[PDB]
Curated annotation (Swiss-Prot), chain A:
Family designation: Belongs to the universal ribosomal protein uL23 family.
Section of the entire sequence shown: 39 to 156 of 156
Sequence ranges of Basic residues compositional bias: 1-29
Localization (cell): Cytoplasm; Nucleus
Protein name: Large ribosomal subunit protein uL23
GO cellular component labels: cytosolic ribosome; nucleus; ribosomal subunit
Annotated GO MF terms: rRNA binding; structural constituent of ribosome
Modified residues (Citrulline): 3
Record flagged with keyword Ubl conjugation: yes
Modified residues (Phosphoserine): 5
Source organism of the structure: Oryctolagus cuniculus
Annotated region (Beta-like import receptor binding (BIB) domain), positions in chain: 1-36
UniProtKB/Swiss-Prot annotation, chain B:
Record-level GO cellular component terms: cytosolic large ribosomal subunit
Annotated protein name in UniProt: Large ribosomal subunit protein uL2
Organism: Oryctolagus cuniculus (Rabbit)
Protein family according to the UniProt entry: Belongs to the universal ribosomal protein uL2 family.
Keywords attached to this entry: Cytoplasm, Hydroxylation, Isopeptide bond, Ribonucleoprotein, Ribosomal protein, RNA-binding, rRNA-binding, Ubl conjugation
Segment of the intact protein contained: 53 to 206 of 257
Record's subcellular location: Cytoplasm
Listed GO biological process terms: cytoplasmic translation
Curated annotation (Swiss-Prot), chain C:
Gene name of the encoded protein: RPL7A
The UniProt record lists the keyword Transmembrane helix: no
Annotated protein name in UniProt: Large ribosomal subunit protein eL8
From-to range in the entire protein, with total length: 80 to 311 of 319
Subcellular location: Cytoplasm
GO cellular component: cytoplasm; ribonucleoprotein complex; ribosome
Cross-link type Glycyl lysine isopeptide (Lys-Gly) (interchain with G-Cter in SUMO2), residue numbers: 22, 71, 212
Function: Component of the large ribosomal subunit. The ribosome is a large ribonucleoprotein complex responsible for the synthesis of proteins in the cell.
Positions bearing N6-acetyllysine: 8, 71, 184
Entry's family note: Belongs to the eukaryotic ribosomal protein eL8 family.
Organism: Oryctolagus cuniculus
Subunit and partners: Component of the large ribosomal subunit. Interacts with CRY1. Interacts with DICER1, AGO2, TARBP2, MOV10 and EIF6; they form a large RNA-induced silencing complex (RISC).
Length: 118, 154, 225
RNA sequence: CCCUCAGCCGAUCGAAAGGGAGUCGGGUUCAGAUCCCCGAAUCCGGAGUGGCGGAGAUGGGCGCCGCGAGGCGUCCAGUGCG
RNA sequence: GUUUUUUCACUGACCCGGUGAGGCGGGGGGGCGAGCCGGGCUCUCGCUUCUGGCGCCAAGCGCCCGGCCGGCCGGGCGCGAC
């Protein structure tokens, strides 16, 4: 029992885990940025349809809170598709627009018809 | 902002495998690669630190402590020296003449580097140009262009 | 059998030579602010000129007698809070179908039976946290002719009862076969405390300088001889 | 968990000109490009039972079988070379 | 004794400086010089000045401590460092 330093450091006391008697909130918050909530509607513009037929990419207006990862999961789940990459820009309207390019197994123009944009 | 050169003196810690570096006020004759020896049993040549109780009368020292363990306060502007007058081995008080001419009594166990401070006689060359004065005081503080009171308003 | 590659290596731990070892620094530690407080509270109590009313609590009962006293005290305990219920189990055999001597605990209910001539021996703890609670009971017990002793540890005297601490503990009565043990206690305690009372009252404690201030005085004393 | 080990010594904020790894050429729009397209690279982070080579690292001294290679058992070295 | 009634100095409130609050004040086996005939004594030191190297996480000595099979492997504790 030898003090080799002229300093007194606070002894490392134990700190227990929480085992709470009741949960603060009754139910977990059901998620509101789901697949349908995240993809609002496709753009049907001159540009968008020109992008569809020339670059093999869809143009959606996307919920402003959403990541590229959440978009890429959503379109895959909502259209039975595969995505090369997603590129997002926030417009001067205060709404996101997500260019979802498809992997070459799927044609944008084949998918545009069945979702109902032409 | 200062006249005298400093000196980065590397000692080795007696207690752990560190190395300590202290900035000193350089005495005229300190060079790089020189050994300096600090404490009681250290010898009396220029650059060494030893208490003013353990050195003869007429020892020209500089960077002299005023209270024992305050790390040196008196005689540390460029080309200054606080010479030792006499001792009092009982009660342990040593007279020292200071750069002004004041002869103060100090507690005899307090340390000082031997020899006069480096960068001496630098108040001999004339500034000549207001620009040199500007460039001097710009390193120190906002004090230079002194407006004399008599020109100012009441 | 003696391997010639095993070699003795000396460490010269003199000034400016070798890195010093890991020795005990329990003396030069910068302690927390509370440890430093309670330590140089115990130093103040040795330097300062302490009055005999406070100081009289540092003349404490000896180890030999205190063991004999707590051996006697251990038979006349108050009942535990769980001991009380099995006495109420023993109610119904006449009800649904003469009280023993204990130690009178606390200061108020010992003070009221020192003034009343109802205490045969009064035990006081030496270490009451505010001392104003207990300062007077020496005077009371002496004046009213009650034999009293001062023990170390209110924690020890509170373990007689079934609580943490208890400042004062009195013997109001004992049984016929345990009369003799109380009799031989009061003899050696009443000769010790109650009869030395003109001596105790004029005896100032403390006023002892530090060991290196004493050792400087002793050097100055043998410097003129 | 509990044992052994730990100085920098000040939370936090402060630069779209300071510090700060790594993308460039051609084409493409009515309006955007070092960002889209085509084609060449590249920096950081990771890999679950570790995905492939190369490196460590395959000498030296023996003894039988042997036409010699070379094999078979033994006994020493090897955390790379000029 | 309890005040009153003057100079020297005491530490303990209070103040300043230092530091990662690291060796303070006594004594003591220990070492040089002081002195009586192995004996016990007052003081002085406490291990590094020839060079622009290297210096930590112990060497050595002493006592026990689980197995496996008084012979078969690695740990703790002092002095070292009063």
């Amino acid at each position: 029992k030898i003090r080799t330093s002229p300093t007194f450091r606070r002894p490392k006391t134990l700190r227990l885990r929480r085992q709470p008697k009741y949960p603060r909130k009754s139910a977990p918050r059901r998620n509101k940025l789901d697949h349908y909530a995240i993809i609002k509607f496709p753009l049907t513009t001159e540009s968008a349809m020109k992008k569809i037929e020339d670059n093999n990419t869809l143009v959606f207006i996307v919920d402003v809170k959403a990541n590229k990862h959440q978009i890429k999961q959503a379109v895959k789940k909502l259209y039975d598709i595969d995505v090369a990459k997603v590129n997002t820009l926030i417009r001067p309207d205060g709404e996101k627009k997500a260019y979802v390019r498809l992997a070459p197994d799927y044609d944008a123009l084949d998918v545009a018809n069945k979702i109902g944009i032409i | 902002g200062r006249g005298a050169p400093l000196a980065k003196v590397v000692f080795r810690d007696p207690y752990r495998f560190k190395k300590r570096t202290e900035l000193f006020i350089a005495a005229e004759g300190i060079h790089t690669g020189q050994f300096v020896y600090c404490g009681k049993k250290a010898q009396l040549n220029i650059g060494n630190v030893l208490p003013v109780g353990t050195m003869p009368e007429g020892t020209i020292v500089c960077c002299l402590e005023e209270k024992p363990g305050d790390r040196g306060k008196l005689a540390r502007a460029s080309g200054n020296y606080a010479t030792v007058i006499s001792h009092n081995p009982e009660t342990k008080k040593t007279r020292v003449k200071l750069p002004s001419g004041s002869k103060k009594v100090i507690s005899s166990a307090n340390r000082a580097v031997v020899g006069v401070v480096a960068g001496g006689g630098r108040i001999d060359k004339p500034i000549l140009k207001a620009g040199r004065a500007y460039h001097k005081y710009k390193a120190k503080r906002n004090c230079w262009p002194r407006v004399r009171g008599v020109a100012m308003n009441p | 059998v003696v391997n010639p590659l095993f070699e003795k290596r000396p460490k010269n731990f003199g000034i400016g030579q070798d890195i010093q070892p890991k020795r005990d620094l329990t003396r030069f530690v910068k302690w927390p602010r509370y440890i430093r407080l309670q330590r140089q509270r115990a130093i103040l109590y040795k330097r300062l000129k302490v009055p005999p009313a406070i100081n009289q609590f540092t003349q404490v009962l000896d180890r030999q007698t205190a063991t004999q006293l707590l051996k006697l005290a251990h038979k006349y305990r108050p009942e535990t809070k769980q001991e009380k219920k099995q006495r109420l189990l023993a109610r119904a055999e006449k009800k649904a179908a003469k009280r023993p001597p204990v130690l009178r605990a606390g200061v108020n209910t010992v003070t009221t039976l020192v003034e009343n001539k109802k205490a045969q021996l009064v035990v006081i703890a030496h270490d009451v946290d505010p001392i104003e609670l207990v300062v007077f009971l020496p005077a009371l017990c002496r004046k009213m002719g009650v034999p009293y002793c001062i023990l170390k540890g209110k924690a020890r005297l509170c373990r007689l009862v079934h609580r943490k601490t208890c400042t004062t503990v009195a013997f109001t009565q004992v049984n016929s076969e345990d009369k003799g043990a109380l009799a031989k206690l009061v003899e050696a305690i009443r000769t010790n405390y109650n009869d030395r009372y003109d001596e105790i009252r004029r005896h100032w404690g403390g006023n002892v300088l530090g060991p290196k201030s004493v050792a400087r005085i002793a050097k100055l004393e043998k410097a003129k001889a």
